Amino acid sequence: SDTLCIGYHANNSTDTVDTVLEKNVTVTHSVNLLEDKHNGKLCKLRGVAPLHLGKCNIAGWILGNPECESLSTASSWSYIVETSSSDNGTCYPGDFIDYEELREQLSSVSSFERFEIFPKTSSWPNHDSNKGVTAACPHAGAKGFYKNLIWLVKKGNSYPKLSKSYINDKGKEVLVLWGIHHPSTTADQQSLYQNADTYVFVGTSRYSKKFKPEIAIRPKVRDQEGRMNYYWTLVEPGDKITFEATGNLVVPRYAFAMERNAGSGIIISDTPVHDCNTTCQTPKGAINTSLPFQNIHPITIGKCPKYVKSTKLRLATGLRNVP
Amino acid sequence: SDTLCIGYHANNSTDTVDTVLEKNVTVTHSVNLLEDKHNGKLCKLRGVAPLHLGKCNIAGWILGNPECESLSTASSWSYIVETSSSDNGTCYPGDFIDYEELREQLSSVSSFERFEIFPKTSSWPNHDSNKGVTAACPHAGAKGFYKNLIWLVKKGNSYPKLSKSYINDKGKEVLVLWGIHHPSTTADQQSLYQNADTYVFVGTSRYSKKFKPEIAIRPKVRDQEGRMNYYWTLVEPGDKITFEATGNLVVPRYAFAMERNAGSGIIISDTPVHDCNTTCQTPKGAINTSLPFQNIHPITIGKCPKYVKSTKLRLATGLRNVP
Amino acid sequence: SDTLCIGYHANNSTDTVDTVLEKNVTVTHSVNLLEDKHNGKLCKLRGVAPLHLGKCNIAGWILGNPECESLSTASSWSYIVETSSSDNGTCYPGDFIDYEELREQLSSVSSFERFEIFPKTSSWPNHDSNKGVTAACPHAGAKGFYKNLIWLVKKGNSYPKLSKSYINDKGKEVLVLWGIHHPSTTADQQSLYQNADTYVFVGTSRYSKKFKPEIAIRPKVRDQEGRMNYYWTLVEPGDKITFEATGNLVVPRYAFAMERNAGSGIIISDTPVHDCNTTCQTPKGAINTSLPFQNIHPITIGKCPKYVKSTKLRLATGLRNVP
Amino acid sequence: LFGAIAGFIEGGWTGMVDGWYGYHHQNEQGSGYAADLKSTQNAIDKITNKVNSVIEKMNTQFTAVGKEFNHLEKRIENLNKKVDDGFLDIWTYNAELLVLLENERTLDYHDSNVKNLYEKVRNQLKNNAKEIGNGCFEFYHKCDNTCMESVKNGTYDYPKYSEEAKLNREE
Amino acid sequence: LFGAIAGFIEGGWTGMVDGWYGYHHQNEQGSGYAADLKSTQNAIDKITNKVNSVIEKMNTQFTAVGKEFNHLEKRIENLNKKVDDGFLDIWTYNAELLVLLENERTLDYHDSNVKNLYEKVRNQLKNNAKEIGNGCFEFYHKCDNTCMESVKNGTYDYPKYSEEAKLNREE
Amino acid sequence: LFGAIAGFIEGGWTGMVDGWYGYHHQNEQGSGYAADLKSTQNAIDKITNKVNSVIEKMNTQFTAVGKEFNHLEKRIENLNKKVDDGFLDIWTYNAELLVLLENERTLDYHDSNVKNLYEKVRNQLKNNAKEIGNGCFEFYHKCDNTCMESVKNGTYDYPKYSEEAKLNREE
Ligand SMILES: *[C@@H]1O[C@H](CO)[C@@H](O[C@@H]2O[C@H](CO)[C@@H](O)[C@H](O)[C@H]2NC(C)=O)[C@H](O)[C@H]1NC(C)=O
Ligand SMILES: *[C@@H]1O[C@H](CO)[C@@H](O[C@@H]2O[C@H](CO)[C@@H](O)[C@H](O)[C@H]2NC(C)=O)[C@H](O)[C@H]1NC(C)=O
Ligand SMILES: *[C@@H]1O[C@H](CO)[C@@H](O[C@@H]2O[C@H](CO)[C@@H](O)[C@H](O)[C@H]2NC(C)=O)[C@H](O)[C@H]1NC(C)=O
Ligand SMILES: *[C@@H]1O[C@H](CO)[C@@H](O)[C@H](O)[C@H]1NC(C)=O
């Protein structure tokens, strides 16, 4: 006699999922909710490439440490990348003031142009712009210095009051860095700048700081018992910046006219940089997902899945596989 | 023959809701869980009105910039409000030290009394309390200055050591502000204070700072090549504050005895202030609700619904509407 | 005729739980998900005891305030404990620089050895290491001072330039603290150090700071119109620290070679310390549980349940109790 | 899902206005809709409780979200932003999904209530009536208004009519 | 909800102490309660798993929540507070609602287990017994203890008794 | 749970490949498996919607998680770490439990669909066939392929065969 039975699917599948009531339940079909694969590459975030410093850090890079000139500086970037051997920084020892804030502010720019605010040949007719070099910042075997700064020293036996202004006619803000030098001894002070007891003064519409050299022996670093502190400010469009000095000023040469973007970050890894787009970047590599969770890395840049500690988040679509 | 059917309700309704399994499902009755309406007004938070600065910012207000005296200062407030044209602040250019921490500390007070800590007529018999005015802080067309500070300048050809104490007998903490003046040139320094090379010293039981004028030309701001930095401290009840100076001190005149409340905030908007109560305030306007979510604004003050990105959170109460 | 009925359990129980649809539902069996009991004791976290300062705070403790020598200093600890009567700190008034960061860095150490970096008997042959005591830091009724610092004053009528280095040969970082003294008056300055107008300079490979005394009358604290600021740095292994001074330096005597652990914290309570293990510590007492939530205290140290505002979180295991 | 609403009872009654679930009779004396007030009320109480549970469990504290940072505090500004933004992402997701989940359940709850009510009736009548389906029962006897009202309030006397029904059932 | 517990089986048995769901028989040889150990155990395992899922999925790391800020760090003090307070609100809400939801589900789970067990029995017996209701079945034949134990462990022989039942059924 | 899958229909059909739920017939003309495409599709749409709900409701904003602090900024470093770690604990727990809950529900959803489909058929046939159980129906008449296809698409004519069935039923 004739029959008609009611029933359900079963198959090949060995996909398991977990439920509140039961673990390791085998199901016909299932879909994964956790991204755990990355491409092993540092890619272009929202279509724009990162700045790759390689041999240097940001300090070395914006100051123009001699080892960083083989880099080429783009005119925009989405995030910055240093490597674990990015050890070329401030070759002359000292304090880089508000450095961490500086790195955050440069982390993304939409426009970046280096330019000679105070041209070497023309700006310093009463001081010596050619000496002012050190074994701490060696170039081609010979004593050198930062590219974007000049260490002004006395001419003959004379350091007359120095006075120099720059008006920002660039229509974007311009980042200006300078440095101040603290000699080891009064003999060194006088060797370089003639007058002991000097001052440096720097000012904009919103900034004003006076600096006095602090002459003493520090512990030797890269053979220096002296020290050099590096400072920086951002001159707004239309504003000007003015320098005044009776010695000890490491004056700017290059500056940078920039347009900041918006909180990006700096990634430190040896993962290689590639041509690829992504919307989510980790130091291990990039993530290409629409899935809401990931377990690759907690420190991401972009529109990222939420980092979780899970190893498996598998969602049943089909039904219990019973044969 | 007789029948009895079992069934369910249906109606007018076009309310839809979403479920995990199905979107746009029409239901008989439904309730909304997301507040999306605000009253377009800045109201009184927990019954007490905000401080509305209008033409000035907090800096201008507490210093007594001449454009802010047409304001009237209440003796308590729940939060502060500035507008986007609150541009009257420190009319004499300089640095307002720990300004942001100051604004956070004044954001809500339960008690606030302005009072003449160092009365003008009586406190400065050996210095000139009447000159000491500037084109940077103009009053009725003529040169003026802050109301809550006096710019003490020399009397005849003499600035004798100044020395003044105040003991806090007010039973609440009192906020004392002062300023220090950095002239353009040694000529100016000597015009105002006679002695070049001066110092100002300020101290309480827990505070102690020495200040030396830094004399140099800054870029002109409101026609000033000089500068003036503003400082502040809170003298705790019973403690005292002492000033000592051979020049360059902008002394207090008014101070404020206050009781801080507890983290409120400052809202910056041109939304008008009104007489209305609320328990939750946004810069766009206030929210009257007991619903757990809102999508009006993320920066709120009060007991607020949680800000979400949803456009619709409608919860089914009734059943599937089928006709 | 014969019958067979199907049914379910009921019992003694009065356990209730709540559901979305219904409150106060009586169930047969139930399990609690919220830890609300603590043992009223401050215990040893992951087997290792906290540092209990009792009478003193961290400032008093690492400086060697005379009231803290009855403490015994362990060579490792999991977290620090102060009481609400931990009022013995810097007996000579002043500013303890970066104090909060210091407390955070000492909150847990795996190794801690106090040692005489600059031995009293041998290190200061041209200065007076015996005078240099004060009524602000009294010992056995008589005037005293910190144990871990020496207040060097002139010998006879002479304070020659002082110059002293220490090289860190300890294979861990060593924490060195020192102080600088600001006299009340030039008479006091000259009484102690002979020369008015002095400087102190301190330096390592990464640290460099010059200090000048600021001579003036402050409001009396513990009978002192002068002041004394306390500074500290961590000398890394192999590096050295150097002191240079023409007066006003309170020189180190003891220093501490330490190994920092990893973010622990300091708890402030009068809850007594006991021999007890725990994996989760609150200021009210310790928590022994594997339940995911707790309502005892929000500020915990260890692997803790999540603090919630709930009074009851009871999960039904059995079924509706119907009799 | 319980197979009743939008299922084996394929439509709703716009004509039944006094409640959520109920009956429609037809005898010699007339016909009409009438809600089951006990089971309707029971559901209202429970749904109400659900709504209030979702609303009233939210802990609200006084807080000023906004902070202001100077131009050399970008890092803590961005820390702050991360916090605000992290909370936004969490609440948005939970709120969205909570609602989606609870709505599926609410709808199913009603399906269940309607099914249980069909079964309640079926097990009173048994063979004294025929299961047409579409939720209707077609009596094998004269069910006057007193009889109807007895089924509706659960006190239907099977014995009374069992013989009148049996003889009618066979033809 | 499945309509069994607090429903068509209107009460529980205080007298059944060896498990959650079961039977009560009555024949010529005696009478008594006896849990279904297979289905009771099955449920315990699954509920246990639920309890452990809720507990053991919580990721806990070593952390010192407390921070200390000086009097010029009010802003980051308040930031810190906003963080602590934000987490409190989130956990409280989720925990409260998690429990409310899971309890509705646990109770329904039991309802289902009891219903499935009734149905298991009904579909073995069929017309060899009468559905009194309140969860009882009234046999049309002599069901000895071996017979009972056969229905309870699902191996009941319909054929064996089908004729003895048929003749008895007609009164 | 609805008692069908892994229950009163004790196994699945590897042989039914064109869908999730369906039938297996056997008459004089042949035999074979065939999915119910309407109810299978219906479920696919709804499950798909569930998957997309869980994925697409996640709000993601642009953020750079990493921050760098100098050696005197331990405290805000640790504040930052507390934030990162707090978010990790929340997301991990919710994600883990979301999935556990939704999987229990998805599986139950299918159980329900299979049960509803059995009931759909049972209430068409009634006494024109016998409920063997294990989800089978054993006809009391000759059900040709047109007849089968009529029960499968819900247009089965009870009257047509009701008499052919009654006479066959009595043996
Ligand atoms: C750039 O970095 C290199 C390596 O990071 C520096 O050279 C090192 O100098 C140390 C100590 O002075 C030597 O002991 C190492 O052998 C050197 N390493 C290498 C790879 O050469 C170099 O001084 C840096 N140059 C500048 C200009 O900063
Ligand atoms: C109050 O602010 C107003 C405008 O915000 C000042 O007036 C401006 O002054 C600037 C610079 O000195 C001039 O370039 C303009 O002529 C003025 N602008 C406008 C819109 O009026 C005014 O000087 C302020 N006064 C004080 C005491 O702070
Ligand atoms: C140690 O702390 C105690 C109090 O905790 C200090 O004693 C107080 O001294 C003041 C004056 O300095 C007296 O007016 C009080 O009578 C004392 N208070 C108590 C409770 O006795 C003590 O001076 C501190 N000593 C050191 C060396 O730090
Ligand atoms: C990345 O994006 C840009 C602009 O949005 C586009 O022109 C380009 O093709 C993309 N690059 C790659 C490698 O896909």
Ligand SMILES: *[C@@H]1O[C@H](CO)[C@@H](O)[C@H](O)[C@H]1NC(C)=O
């Ligand atoms: C706001 O509430 C307080 C309650 O004390 C009341 O005095 C006041 O009148 C209220 N104001 C308005 C405008 O409703």
Ligand SMILES: *[C@H]1O[C@H](CO)[C@@H](O)[C@H](O)[C@H]1NC(C)=O
């Ligand atoms: C629906 O119709 C009713 C009665 O005709 C009326 O009271 C109500 O205003 C109408 N509202 C809608 C939902 O259109």
Ligand SMILES: *[C@H]1O[C@H](CO)[C@@H](O)[C@H](O)[C@H]1NC(C)=O
């Ligand atoms: C605490 O436990 C540790 C190891 O678990 C053990 O060594 C110690 O004796 C215990 N101390 C207590 C609980 O008193």
